[PDB]
Amino acid sequence: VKLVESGGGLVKPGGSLKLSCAASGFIFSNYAMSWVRQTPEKRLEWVATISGGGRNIYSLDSVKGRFTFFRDNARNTLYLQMSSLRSEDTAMYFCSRENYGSSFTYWGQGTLVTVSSAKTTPPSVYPLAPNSMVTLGCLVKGYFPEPVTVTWNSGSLSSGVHTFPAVLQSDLYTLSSSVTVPSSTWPSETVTCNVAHPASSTKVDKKIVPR
């Protein structure tokens, strides 16, 4: 059972957005599907559920008149049509499959929807440079909306890496990422943080050089 959601992104208050969920691995028309969302405070909220054949549709009352749900059983696909979006609707949206006895039995990876008037803005990426280990980072500043993606040396360096959660300040997110590597291998060998921000189609590869 694979479920993969798409179509998320930034939209202005009042606007519209269409989400998709593609299923495989099962006879799609036999199972009810559901949309479930998670706000930035991490509360989960059921939004709607639609029966296998699509005749019965149950949803939250606050989305009646605005959200529409349907499914194409031939194409193995589920859809959510949003309109009159409000800032409260900002959330990760998850599709999910029912199963005898339980409600949200298999979940997808989710797709992030940001309802807001802030302009899209690509990140600026800056090297953070300064014992057997040494710590480096990069600062990803002034971007919008979430998410960004940060790898070190194109993924060849997962060992001692963490990324801090982004922080909003005046319509722009800011985030940082640290890596820890052996002193003897840096500067001698190179360290490069790779940042991608799909919402602006930006990719920056920023080499950490000593001061």
């Binding site: 991490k42 009352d61 409600s103 953070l128 801090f164």
Partner: protein, 217 residues
């Protein structure tokens, strides 16, 4: 609308020790058909929620025997016999008996490990950032336990509250630690105006601060 609460909000527990999470509904959640559709979900950091338990006490397929569900009417419990590090995260109850279906607000399970002190790094801004009129100064406090910590910025010896942003990781399941970032954002003009930059970190692993510092030269 039916209504779920969970307790406690967070739950600190040692490896191999036991844990219990309570879920209360504001009214009965028996379905007309006779069943109780109460389910428990676990969301590990950076992941989708996963089903653990359905209809109050039935372990979903693949879920370890260490998880068990009980309760009746309006009160329910998730018990974990023996806590592993992988079990870290947020646990949500959910009722599926009465439209609109609802979740509890979540319960953070925290692994209690041996105390650890932060490893402090401090970073002057890049020349690339200065050239465009900005100057961020960053402090990393890596791999410490417990999560409570105080950080402060001093510039030429005096404190700075203004323009300081802080960010904590979730707890890491590899070790069982927390990290935090602290950033002080200034103009190049405000940055060149001073010389000594310092973050001091306070934590129960020591009676006295951990201080990293640099001089703009």
């Amino acid at each position: 609308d039916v209504l779920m609460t969970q307790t406690p909000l967070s739950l600190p527990v040692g490896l191999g020790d036991q844990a219990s999470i309570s879920c209360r509904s504001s009214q009965s959640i028996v379905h007309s058909n006779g069943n109780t559709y109460l389910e428990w979900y676990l969301q590990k950091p950076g992941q989708s929620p996963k089903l653990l338990i359905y209809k109050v006490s039935n372990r979903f397929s693949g879920v370890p025997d260490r998880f068990s569900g009980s309760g009746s009417g309006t009160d329910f419990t998730l018990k974990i016999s023996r806590v592993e590090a992988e079990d870290l995260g947020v646990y949500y109850c959910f009722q599926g008996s009465h439209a609109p279906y609802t979740f509890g607000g979540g319960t953070k399970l925290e692994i209690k490990r041996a105390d650890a002190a932060p490893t402090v790094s401090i970073f002057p801004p890049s020349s690339e950032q200065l050239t465009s009129g900005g100057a961020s100064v960053v402090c990393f406090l890596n791999n410490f336990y417990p999560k409570d910590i105080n950080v402060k910025w001093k510039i030429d010896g005096s404190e700075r509250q203004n323009g300081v942003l802080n960010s904590w990781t979730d707890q890491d399941s590899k070790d069982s630690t927390y990290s935090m970032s602290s950033t002080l954002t200034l103009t190049k003009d405000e940055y060149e105006r001073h010389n000594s930059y310092t973050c001091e970190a306070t934590h129960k692993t020591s009676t006295s601060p951990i201080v990293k510092s640099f001089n703009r030269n």
